Amino acid sequence: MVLYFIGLGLYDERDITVKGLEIAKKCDYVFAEFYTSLMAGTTLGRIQKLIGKEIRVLSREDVELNFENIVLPLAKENDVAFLTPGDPLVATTHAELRIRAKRAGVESYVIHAPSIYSAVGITGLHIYKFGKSATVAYPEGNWFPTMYYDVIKENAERGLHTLLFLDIKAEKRMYMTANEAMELLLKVEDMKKGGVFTDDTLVVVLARAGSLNPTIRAGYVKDLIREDFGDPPHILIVPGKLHIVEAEYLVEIAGAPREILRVNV
């Protein structure tokens, strides 16, 4: 009958919306993927208990190569749901799956859930001031990604904040920490020498957004690069020019150095 893309939220099984839970509980088949992000405060068991259904977990290969062969066929005679961490269509390629649904003659609906993209609002940074976003990918082999460095540069030049999604290798259970992202950025800085990311750069770290006590820290790279921000997932933000109110929140809530209050207008 129909296919539902339902977000599970930021941290635990309760970050799903009431709308999402009520709809998920009535579906005949429930699929899910847990490779696009990490929900550090729950387990498949708890999610299954809350929804009261067995969930078939799909790999990136199952989705990217066989979504129309695994999920869509059932969505023809049944109500099917496809669950994902955070919001289904944020920093994923899942939107394209709706195109496959259409071609397969399957109607699809989207149920949103809290997302890291908007959750960054808890850092006190004005969300409208964010510019282009990027992802810090783990170097592999002789391939060392560095494009995210240029994104930061372009944004900072315009006084905009840069949100940096951090890498994740779900199968290896590897989640990139803000510390690793900073290390990589310093290395890129040495090669490019654009003066974009140095030990004196002010950065912001948000770890485990969604939990009741996420880690929110702001400060210079030289002081934060070896700080313990707790378990993943983490996101790194490189702010552009700060408004006084943003600085005030970073100081009061994120433990930032009180000197950033002095904005060089």
For residues 243 and 115, give the distance between their C-alpha atoms in angstroms, rounded to a whole number: 24
Q: Is 11 in the site for Na ion (CB under 5 A)?
A: no
87 labeled part of a ligand binding site: yes
Q: Which residues pair with 168 in a beta bridge?
A: 175
Question: Which partner in Na ion, ligand SAH, its own copies, none is near 238 (CB below 5 to 8 A by kind)?
Answer: none
Residue in 40, 71, 80, 87 binding its own copies, rule: CB under 8 A: 87
Query: What are the CB-based long-range contacts (under 8 Å, 24+) for 144-149?
Result: 146/188, 146/191, 146/192, 148/185, 149/185, 149/188, 149/189, 149/192, 149/194, 149/196, 149/197
In DSSP notation, 35-62 reads SSS--TT--HHHHHHHHTS-EEE--HHH
- Measured at CB, which residue is nearest to ligand SAH? 86
Q: Is 89 in the site for its own copies (CB under 8 A)?
A: yes
Phi, psi of 91 (to 5 degrees): 55, 40
Pick between residue 176 and residue 260 the one whose CB is nearest to ligand SAH.
Answer: 176
DSSP 3-state of 4: strand
10 labeled part of a ligand binding site: yes
- Give the list of residues 6+ apart from residue 81 with CB closer than 8 angstroms, or none: 3, 4, 6, 23, 24, 27, 29, 30, 31
Residue in 130, 175, 197, 249 binding Na ion, rule: CB under 5 A: 130
133 labeled part of a ligand binding site: no
For residues 237 and 160, give the distance between their C-alpha atoms in angstroms, rounded to a whole number: 11
Residue in 213, 228, 259, 265 binding its own copies, rule: CB under 8 A: 213
Binding site residues, ligand SAH, CB under 6 A: 10-11, 36-37, 85-87, 90-92, 115-118, 165-166, 168, 206-210, 233-235
Contact 218, 189 (CB under 8 A): no
For residues 180 and 170, give the distance between their C-alpha atoms in angstroms, rounded to a whole number: 17
Query: Within 143-172, which residues bind its own copies (CB under 8 A)?
Result: 154, 158, 160, 165
Q: What is the DSSP letter of 227?
A: -
Stretch that binds its own copies, among 56-64, 122-130, 191-199, 228-236 (CB under 8 A): 122-130
In DSSP notation, 139-178 reads PBTTB---HHHHHHHHHHHTT-BEEEEEPEETTTTEE--H
Q: Is 106 in the site for its own copies (CB under 8 A)?
A: no
Q: Is 99 in the site for its own copies (CB under 8 A)?
A: yes
Pick between residue 79 and residue 198 the one whose CB is nearest to its own copies.
Answer: 79
Q: Which residues bind Na ion (CB under 5 A)?
A: 130
For the annotated binding site for S-adenosyl-L-methionine, the residues are: 10, 87, 90, 115-116, 166, 209, 234
Q: Which residues bind its own copies (CB under 8 A)?
A: 7, 9-10, 12-19, 21-22, 50, 86-93, 95-96, 98-99, 102, 109-115, 117-119, 121-122, 124, 126-135, 154, 158, 160, 165, 209-210, 212-213, 245, 248-249, 252-253
For the annotated binding site, the residues are: 10, 87, 90, 115-116, 166, 209, 234
